[PDB]
Each structure stands twice: as C-alpha cells, then as structure tokens.
Amino acid sequence: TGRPEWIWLALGTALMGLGTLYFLVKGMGVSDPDAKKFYAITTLVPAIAFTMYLSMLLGYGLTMVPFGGEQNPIYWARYADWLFTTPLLLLDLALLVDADQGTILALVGADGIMIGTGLVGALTKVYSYRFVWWAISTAAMLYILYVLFFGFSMRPEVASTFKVLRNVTVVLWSAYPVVWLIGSEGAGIVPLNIETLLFMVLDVSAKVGLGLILLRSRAIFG
Amino acid sequence: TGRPEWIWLALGTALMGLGTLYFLVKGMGVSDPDAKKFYAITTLVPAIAFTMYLSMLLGYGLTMVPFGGEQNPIYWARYADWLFTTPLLLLDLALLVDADQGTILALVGADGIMIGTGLVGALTKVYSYRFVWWAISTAAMLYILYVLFFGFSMRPEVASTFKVLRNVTVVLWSAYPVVWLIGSEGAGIVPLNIETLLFMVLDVSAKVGLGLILLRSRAIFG
Amino acid sequence: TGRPEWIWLALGTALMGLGTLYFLVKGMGVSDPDAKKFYAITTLVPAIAFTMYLSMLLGYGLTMVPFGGEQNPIYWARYADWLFTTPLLLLDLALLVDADQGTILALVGADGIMIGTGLVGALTKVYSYRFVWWAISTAAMLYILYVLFFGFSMRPEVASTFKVLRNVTVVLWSAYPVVWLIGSEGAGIVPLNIETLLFMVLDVSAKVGLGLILLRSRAIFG
Numbered sequence: 001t002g003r004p005e006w007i008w009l010a011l012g013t014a015l016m017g018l019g020t021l022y023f024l025v026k027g028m029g030v031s032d033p034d035a036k037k038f039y040a041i042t043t044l045v046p047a048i049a050f051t052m053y054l055s056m057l058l059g060y061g062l063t064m065v066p067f068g069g070e071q072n073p074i075y076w077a078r079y080a081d082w083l084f085t086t087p088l089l090l091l092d093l094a095l096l097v098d099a100d101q102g103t104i105l106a107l108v109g110a111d112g113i114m115i116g117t118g119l120v121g122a123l124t125k126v127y128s129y130r131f132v133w134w135a136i137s138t139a140a141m142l143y144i145l146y147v148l149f150f151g152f153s154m155r156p157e158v159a160s161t162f163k164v165l166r167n168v169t170v171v172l173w174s175a176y177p178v179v180w181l182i183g184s185e186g187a188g189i190v191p192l193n194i195e196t197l198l199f200m201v202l203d204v205s206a207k208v209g210l211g212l213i214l215l216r217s218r219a220i221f222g
Numbered sequence: 223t224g225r226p227e228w229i230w231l232a233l234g235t236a237l238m239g240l241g242t243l244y245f246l247v248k249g250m251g252v253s254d255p256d257a258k259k260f261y262a263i264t265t266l267v268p269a270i271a272f273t274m275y276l277s278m279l280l281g282y283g284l285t286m287v288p289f290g291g292e293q294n295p296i297y298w299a300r301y302a303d304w305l306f307t308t309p310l311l312l313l314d315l316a317l318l319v320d321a322d323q324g325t326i327l328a329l330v331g332a333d334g335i336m337i338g339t340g341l342v343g344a345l346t347k348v349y350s351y352r353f354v355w356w357a358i359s360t361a362a363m364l365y366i367l368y369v370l371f372f373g374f375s376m377r378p379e380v381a382s383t384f385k386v387l388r389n390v391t392v393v394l395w396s397a398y399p400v401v402w403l404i405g406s407e408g409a410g411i412v413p414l415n416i417e418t419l420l421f422m423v424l425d426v427s428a429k430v431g432l433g434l435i436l437l438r439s440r441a442i443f444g
Numbered sequence: 445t446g447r448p449e450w451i452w453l454a455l456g457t458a459l460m461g462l463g464t465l466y467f468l469v470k471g472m473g474v475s476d477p478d479a480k481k482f483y484a485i486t487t488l489v490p491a492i493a494f495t496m497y498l499s500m501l502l503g504y505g506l507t508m509v510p511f512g513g514e515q516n517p518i519y520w521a522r523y524a525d526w527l528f529t530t531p532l533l534l535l536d537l538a539l540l541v542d543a544d545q546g547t548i549l550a551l552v553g554a555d556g557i558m559i560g561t562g563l564v565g566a567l568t569k570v571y572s573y574r575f576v577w578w579a580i581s582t583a584a585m586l587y588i589l590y591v592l593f594f595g596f597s598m599r600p601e602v603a604s605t606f607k608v609l610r611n612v613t614v615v616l617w618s619a620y621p622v623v624w625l626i627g628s629e630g631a632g633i634v635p636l637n638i639e640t641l642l643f644m645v646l647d648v649s650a651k652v653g654l655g656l657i658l659l660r661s662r663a664i665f666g
C-alpha cells in the first residue's frame with residue numbers, strides 16, 4: 001500500500017504461511033507421542049505468526065500512539081503473536097531436555113512478563129517511561145537466557161540438538177530489544193520500514209529456521 | 223429493551239445459568255478423579271457462557287463497527303466466551319479417548335486460531351477483508367474436525383459415547399461459520415435478531431445438551 | 445504526583461519488587477523438583493504484581509469510567525494482575541495437598557470467572573449493574589473458599605502448613621469484595637486514596653506475606 005513497510009509484512013506473511021504448511025505436511029504420519037508434541041508445538045508457532053503478519057499487512061494490527069508530540073505508528077499485533085509463540089518456543093527446548101515443571105513455569109512466566117511489559121512500553125505515551133518498560137522486559141529476557149544456560153544424563157542426541165537450538169535462541173532473541181530500542185517504538189533512529197524488515201528476518205529465522213533444525217533431528221523421538 | 227434480540231439473550235442467559243446449577247449439583251458426591259475432571263470441565267463451560275450472555279444482555283459485550291459505511295452492532299463478547307469454552311469442549315473429547323498430549327496441543331492451538339481470527343474478522347472495518355478472516359478461521363475449524371475424525375483399544379463404553387459426542391460436535395460447530403457468514407457480521411442477509419436466536423440455540427445445544435449426554439455416561443468413570 | 449494515592453502505589457511497587465528479589469535469591473540452590481515448583485510459582489506472583497503496581501504508578505493502568513454522571517478513575521491494571529496471580533496462588537495450595545486435576549481445573553476456572561466479572565463490573569457504565577457483576581464475582585469467590593475448606597493421608601507437615609495458608613487465604617481474599625463495594629468502583633463511601641491503601645496492604649500480605657510462610661516450611665520438599 002502507501003505504507004513502505006508493506007512489502008516486508010507481505011513477505012513475512014508468505015514465509016510464515018509456507019513454513020506452516022511445510023511443517024504440517026511433514027508431521028503427517030508421525031505416530032511417536034514424543035515426536036507428536038514437537039510437531040504440534042513447532043507447527044503452531046508459524047501458524048500464529050502467519051495470522052498476526054496478515055493482520056499487520058491489512059492494517060488491523062496497527063495503532064497510532066502519541067508520544068514526543070507526534071502520532072507514532074505502532075504495530076501492536078507483534079505482541080499478540082509473541083505472547084503465545086515465545087512460550088511455545090521455550091516449551092520445545094524444555095521438553096527436549098525433560099525440564100522439571102517448576103523450571104518450565106519459571107520460564108513461561110518470565111516470558112509473559114517480557115512480552116507484556118514490552119507491550120506496555122510500546123503503548124506508553126510518556127516518552128521517557130517507554131524505556132523503563134524496555135529495561136524491565138530486557139531483565140526478564142536475561143533471566144530466561146540465564147536459565148537456558150545454567151539451569152540444565154540426556155542421551156547424546158538430545159544434548160547435541162539442544163546445544164545448537166540454545167545457541168540459535170540466545171543470538172536471535174537478544175537482537176529484538178536492540179531493534180526496538182533503535183526503532184520507531186524507542187529512539188526512532190531507524191525508520192519503521194527498516195525496523196519491520198529486521199523483525200521479519202528475526203521472526204522467520206526464530207520460527208521457521210529454528211523449527212527446520214529441530215524437526216530434522218532424531219532428538220524428538222523416543 | 224429496545225434491542226429486538228434482547229429476548230434471545232435473556233433466554234440464553236437463563237438456560238446457561240440453569241444448566242450450570244444443574245451440573246454443579248449433579249457433580250456433588252463424585253469422588254472418582256477421572257469423573258471429577260469431566261464434571262469440572264463440563265460445569266465451567268456453561269458457567270462462562272452464562273456470564274457472557276449476561277454481558278450481551280446488559281449491553282456491555284456490544285460494540286459498533288463501521289463497515290459498508292454503516293454502524294454495525296457487533297457482539298464481541300461471544301468471542302471471549304468461545305475463546306475459553308471451545309478448547310474446554312475439545313478437552314472433554316480428548317480426555318475421553320486418552321489423546322496424546324501432542325494432539326491435545328494441536329487441537330487447543332488450532333482452536334485459539336479459529337476464535338481469534340473470527341474476532342479479528344468481526345472487528346475489521348474493510349468489508350471484503352472480513353471474509354478473508356472468515357476463511358482462515360474456517361480452515362482452522364476443518365483441521366479440528368479432521369483430527370476428531372482421523373486422529374483417534376478404548377473400552378467399548380468410551381468408543382460409544384465418544385462417537386455420539388463427536389457426531390454432535392461436527393454438526394453443531396459446522397453451523398457457526400454459516401450463521402456468521404449470512405448474519406450481521408458477514409453478508410447481512412439475516413437480521414441481527416434472527417442471528418442471535420440461531421446462536422442461542424447452537425450454544426445451548428453445544429454446551430448444555432452436549433454435557434447432558436456426557437455426564438450421563440459411565441464413560442467418564444475409571 | 446497530583447494523585448494523592450500515588451504514595452501507596454509507590455510503596456506497593458517497592459514492596460512487590462523487594463519481595464520478588466528476596467524470593468528469587470532464596471530459591472537459588474534449590475534442586476528438589478517439588479520445591480522448584482513452589483519457588484517458581486511463589487516468585488512469579490509478586491513479580492507480576494510489581495509490574496502492574498508500576499503501571500498504576502506511572503498512570504498507564506488507569507482509565508476514566510462514566511457512571512453516576514461523573515468521570516470515575518478506575519485502576520484496571522489490578523485485574524490484569526489478579527487474573528494471573530490468583531490462580532497461581534491457588535496452584536500453590538493445590539500442589540501442597542496433591543489435589544486431583546479435576547479439582548484444580550474447577551478452582552482456576554472459578555477464579556477466572558471471579559476476576560473477569562470483577563473487571564466487567566469495574567468498567568460497566570450503568571451504575572446499578574456494577575453490583576450485579578459484583579455479586580456474581582462474589583459467588584465465584586465463595587465457591588473457591590468452599591472448595592479450599594470441604595474438598596480436601598498427607599504427611600503431617602503438609603496438613604499443618606496448608607491449614608495456616610488456607611486460613612490466611614480465606615481472611616484476606618474475603619476482604620477484597622468489601623473494599624471494592626465501599627470504594628470508588630462501588631458505592632464511593634471510601635475515597636480512592638484510602639481504597640488504594642487498603643488494596644496495597646491486602647496485596648502485599650496475600651503475596652509476599654503468604655509466600656514467606658510457604659517458602660519457610662519443609663512442606664514444599666519431597
């Protein structure tokens with residue numbers, strides 16, 4: 001449309017749609033109960049992202065936020081996506097290593113705090129306070145990355161695949177707070193169309209790329 | 223009130239209230255842990271519906287949506303109801319057949335997508351796009367109905383009762399997308415007062431009728 | 445600020461922050477899987493409350509509701525807090541006594557109804573109807589208190605600690621509907637600044653005080 005960022009929302013829509021169908025077809029035939037879990041979780045993630053990319057594309061998931069005395073376009077639908085997809089991504093890792101339920105609840109809950117405070121920050125009209133919410137959200141993210149690194153007799157296959165996905169996760173997830181900070185939600189150093197591109201690349205890698213690694217491994221089978 | 227559809231919201235309120243109290247009293251005394259689950263799930267469903275029918279009745283769960291250059295009355299509270307009650311209904315079926323957790327997560331997640339895209343469609347102001355959301359939601363529903371039919375050594379009692387509830391579910395749930403399509407949320411072929419009547423009949427059958435079948439069966443006991 | 449109630453939102457923010465860090469440090473080293481669950485649940489509760497107290501403090505979690513022909517300040521963020529923290533509090537009790545899953549689902553669901561109808565009541569613009577929502581919410585609360593009292597061979601340690609926390613819970617939770625009723629959300633008999641103080645004291649006792657009792661007991665260890 002007249003929104004320069006439309007092309008990246010269109011491409012992301014397409015790529016999440018296509019990954020969803022690919023993982024769907026792939027999980028056809030799986031009867032192993034353990035594998036079943038990894039396919040459900042991993043197929044759902046880009047399915048949800050597909051819907052929220054399309055809602056941004058059609059303009060539904062966009063709102064105007066007054067701050068710095070301007071009307072700032074804020075894509076709120078990203079937070080509806082992440083609210084569900086990031087705990088699912090953490091569940092994939094947690095199941096792989098057979099984490100204790102107490103640790104899974106710590107992780108999902110920290111995650112909810114991360115996304116919910118990011119959303120409040122995105123919609124806050126007092127500019128300086130936006131970054132207070134950014135910092136609390138970032139602290140939640142560092143708690144999560146900590147646990148993925150220092151909170152975990154797995155069969156070798158499990159440990160191998162987990163080490164790769166854990167390294168993927170730390171690198172990609174750590175980039176999101178930076179893009180927000182420099183982008184239209186934060187300091188406004190990078191235009192919205194470039195921000196939208198950055199988040200598209202991170203999202204497709206974190207969802208489809210990550211699932212391609214996981215669903216190709218024997219680590220998911222009993 | 224001055225809303226011709228009030229009578230059906232009043233009747234639905236009453237019928238969901240009464241079913242909730244009936245199942246409540248009925249589950250008094252049950253000590254079988256397995257039966258306990260079916261009573262909790264099955265009592266909660268019309269309890270939630272009761273509150274959302276009352277919110278429509280009192281006018282709280284109604285908003286105006288501009289589309290086709292008019293102010294269209296949209297009852298959004300239905301989606302708050304269904305967001306919780308339809309996965310619970312699916313949990314009743316899934317527990318009956320002892321489904322794998324991976325399959326339960328596929329089902330609840332597809333369901334969330336179904337209701338959430340229906341809600342976006344209901345609130346979208348660009349008329350043609352309303353039906354794009356309708357179609358994606360419908361695809362999620364067909365995924366769910368598929369799984370209930372081709373994704374499932376149960377004791378005979380389980381298989382019997384499941385076959386009846388599965389047939390009830392496919393027939394009733396399949397009607398909802400049609401009522402939406404022909405009603406005030408969609409093409410506007412049927413007036414709001416008749417739409418509201420249709421949804422009342424489906425809801426009371428899908429919640430109270432369905433629970434009456436289930437809670438009468440020995441299939442729910444270990 | 446210019447809001448007389450700010451001081452109590454500031455103190456609550458601080459006290460929830462401090463309890464969160466205290467329980468965090470305390471749970472460092474715990475390896476017992478059962479203890480792990482109680483620490484996760486119990487640390488998360490004031491973590492969430494911290495964020496919602498801060499959102500009230502900064503003004504984000506406040507909205508104006510027209511009723512009785514005035515503009516009534518309503519802190520909606522309390523309901524976002526309670527929606528997650530009160531089922532977690534109930535999960536702490538339920539795990540302690542090893543409740544059946546059917547009973548846990550009854551409890552969490554009744555709780556969701558309690559908070560969600562309280563939220564509708566808080567935002568309803570027709571004054572008399574506010575108290576209809578109050579009454580339904582109160583009925584949900586009485587269902588919950590009933591179950592905590594008449595729905596439950598635990599080792600003595602479990603029974604002891606549970607009896608104390610159950611008595612704490614009944615007394616504190618029962619006060620919330622009274623404060624709402626007499627406060628700015630209800631009859632407007634008590635000013636907002638005094639209401640905010642009352643809820644701060646209840647919240648810090650129900651979250652941090654309650655967790656201090658629980659996390660000090662051996663009841664949480666296998």
Ligand SMILES: CC(C)CCCCCCCCCCCC[C@H](C)CCCCCCCC(C)C
Pocket residue numbers: 015018019022201204205208209210212
């Ligand atoms: C059959 C397999 C290989 C998957 C193909 C399904 C299609 C959709 C996504 C698959 C590709 C993505 C690889 C994961 C990692 C990346 C860093 C993706 C970032 C996007 C950049 C655009 C490059 C081209 C693409 C169209 C994939």
Ligand SMILES: CC(C)CCCCCCCCCCCC[C@H](C)CCCCCCCC(C)C
Pocket residue numbers: 237240241244423426427430431432434
């Ligand atoms: C004790 C038993 C039989 C239950 C009675 C509790 C009351 C509430 C609901 C029970 C009746 C509903 C039967 C399920 C199926 C239906 C198709 C219901 C659709 C509604 C149509 C109105 C007909 C009359 C009613 C008042 C039940």
Ligand SMILES: CC(C)CCCCCCCCCCCC[C@H](C)CCCCCCCC(C)C
Pocket residue numbers: 459462463466645648649652653654656
């Ligand atoms: C190390 C221990 C004792 C905990 C201290 C951590 C700090 C935060 C909360 C701890 C104190 C609260 C006790 C629980 C019960 C109460 C009734 C609290 C209500 C608040 C009243 C204010 C009194 C002083 C306070 C600053 C704690």
Ligand SMILES: *C/C=C(C)/C=C/C=C(C)/C=C/C1=C(C)CCCC1(C)C
Pocket residue numbers: 082085086089114115117118119133134137138139141173174176177180203206207
């Ligand atoms: C599918 C997408 C994923 C994996 C997205 C992850 C998003 C985050 C890790 C976002 C984190 C943020 C913060 C740490 C700071 C505040 C802003 C956020 C929400 C972008």
Ligand SMILES: *C/C=C(C)/C=C/C=C(C)/C=C/C1=C(C)CCCC1(C)C
Pocket residue numbers: 304307308311336337339340341355356359360361363395396398399402425428429
């Ligand atoms: C208690 C009520 C139940 C069982 C309701 C079920 C509702 C659905 C199956 C609704 C489905 C819809 C679609 C498939 C298309 C878009 C519109 C919806 C949300 C009505």
Ligand SMILES: *C/C=C(C)/C=C/C=C(C)/C=C/C1=C(C)CCCC1(C)C
Pocket residue numbers: 526529530533558559561562563577578581582583585617618620621624647650651
């Ligand atoms: C951390 C805070 C807790 C334990 C809060 C509990 C809040 C309740 C028990 C609130 C109950 C209410 C009703 C019973 C009636 C309507 C108003 C409410 C929501 C305050």
